Every structure is written in C-alpha cells, then in structure tokens.
Amino acid sequence: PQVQFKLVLVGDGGTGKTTFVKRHLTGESEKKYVATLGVEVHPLVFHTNRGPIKFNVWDTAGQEKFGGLRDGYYIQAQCAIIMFDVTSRVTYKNVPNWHRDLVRVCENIPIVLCGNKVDIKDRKVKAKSIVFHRKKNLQYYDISAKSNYNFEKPFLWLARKLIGDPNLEFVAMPALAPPEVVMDPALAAQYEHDLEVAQTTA
Amino acid sequence: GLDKFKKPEGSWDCEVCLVQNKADSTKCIACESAKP
Numbered sequence A: 001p002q003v004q005f006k007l008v009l010v011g012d013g014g015t016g017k018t019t020f021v022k023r024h025l026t027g028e029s030e031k032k033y034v035a036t037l038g039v040e041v042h043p044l045v046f047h048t049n050r051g052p053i054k055f056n057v058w059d060t061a062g063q064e065k066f067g068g069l070r071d072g073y074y075i076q077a078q079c080a081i082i083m084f085d086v087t088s089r090v091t092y093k094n095v096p097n098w099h100r101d102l103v104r105v106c107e108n109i110p111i112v113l114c115g116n117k118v119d120i121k122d123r124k125v126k127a128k129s130i131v132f133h134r135k136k137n138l139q140y141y142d143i144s145a146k147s148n149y150n151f152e153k154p155f156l157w158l159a160r161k162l163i164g165d166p167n168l169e170f171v172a173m174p175a176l177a178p179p180e181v182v183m184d185p186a187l188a189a190q191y192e193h194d195l196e197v198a199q200t201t202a
Numbered sequence B: 001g002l003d004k005f006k007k008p009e010g011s012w013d014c015e016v017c018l019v020q021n022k023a024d025s026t027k028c029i030a031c032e033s034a035k036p
C-alpha cells in the first residue's frame, strides 16, 4: 500500500505547468490520461527519509485558457501548486482567482505558490511584489521548470504539511530531464537574496 | 518510518486517474470510471 496524494497544478495557460510536471522522468513515462476530464495524471515518486511518497499531479489539457476547470478536476485534491509566470504580471494578478477556486472546492488543503520562468533575465514580477502568499498561509518558491531550478521545493514543503513531520527530508533527487536552459548562478543567488530580504525586512 | 500507514478498509485506487475511493463506492468520485 503506497502513500499517495492527489496534487492539482493550476494557474493561467502558458505559465509552464506542463513543462514543470514533465521534468520528472518516471512521472512522464507512467502518466495516465483521463479522457472524461481532459487530464494527464503524473505519478511523481519522491524518496523520503521515512520511505517513498507519490504525488499524483493533475495536469490540464489546456482548458484553463477558456474557463474554469470542472469540479471533477478538483475532487479529492489533497494539495495544490498555483503557478504563475514571473515575466507576465497578468498571470500573477490571476493568482487570487485560482486560490479562490481551489478553496471553494477543497477548503484548507496545503497550497504552494510558484513563480516560474525565473531563468529569463527580463523579470517582471519580483520578490518585493510577491505578497499573496504572506496573507494566506501559502509558501512561495521561485522556480524554473526548464532548468529544474528549485524543482523539489514545492513537493518537500507539501509533504511535510501532509505528513505532519517538519523534519521530513528527500534522501535523493528524482531523475529529472536534463536542463534545457541554464539557470545563471549569479541570477539565482540574486533572486535568492531578494526573497530573503523581502521575507525578513521590517 | 512510514511503517504505520494504512488505507481505509476496503478502499480502492482508481485505475484511470489514481484517486482513492471508498469501499462502498462503485464508481470513481473524480473521473466516474468503474471500480476495477
């Protein structure tokens, strides 16, 4: 009997949700297509110090471009990632709408907010502006799907909340698709610094 | 460890979308597929 969680991955079209979930190679080779709902469920195993956990990540087939997702998509979700694109302010402006839709169907499940595409130099949504998570008990991470930057962080935070073990760790990284773009180390360090300052500043 | 993990008695995993369903359910609560 495997420990597994349904994770819904939501956010505006074009933010990188499919690119992000596909980084996990076994999750892609073992994905399941759900015809009735237009979903690809990716079974993502992570190996923790207490054993394996599986996040069954629900990736849309693009329907979020045209309207809200159907109830079946959200049903029995146990956690979520809301994604936006740090190069598009519109996608960050829609984050409260995604959070609203989640909480309406799923109440207080743990949610992580992810700002994707931080590999791109001309960044528009910077750390100082990313404040939605502060007021709602959400955890925030910068991510770059195309470079695997911070890939594991949303999943570790969720796993800790779901299991109720603040000391849970991943003993190894999952096998991920090789980076397609470089995440500049100086840029990452600067963005990491900017978030730390934003989180600590009075 | 996770040695103390167990699923509810009679619960079953949907073979189409992987959602865990109740023992008395005949169809998946999410995707409506029949119980395997």
Ligand SMILES: Nc1nc2c(ncn2[C@@H]2O[C@H](COP(=O)(O)OP(=O)(O)O)[C@@H](O)[C@H]2O)c(=O)[nH]1
Binding pocket: A011, A012, A013, A014, A015, A016, A017, A018, A019, A020, A116, A117, A118, A119, A120, A143, A144, A145, A146, A147, A181
């Ligand atoms: N530079 C960069 N492009 C990304 C990243 N993630 C996705 N993209 C691209 O953004 C476009 C939308 O990606 P997609 O995964 O289809 O987004 P979705 O509609 O949210 O599922 C595509 O051209 C991706 O190649 C990223 O981390 N960095």
Ligand SMILES: [Mg+2]
Binding pocket: A017, A018, A019, A059, A060, A061, A062
């Ligand atoms: Mg997609």
Ligand SMILES: [Zn+2]
Binding pocket: B014, B015, B016, B017, B018, B019, B028, B029, B030, B031, B032, B033
């Ligand atoms: Zn199902």
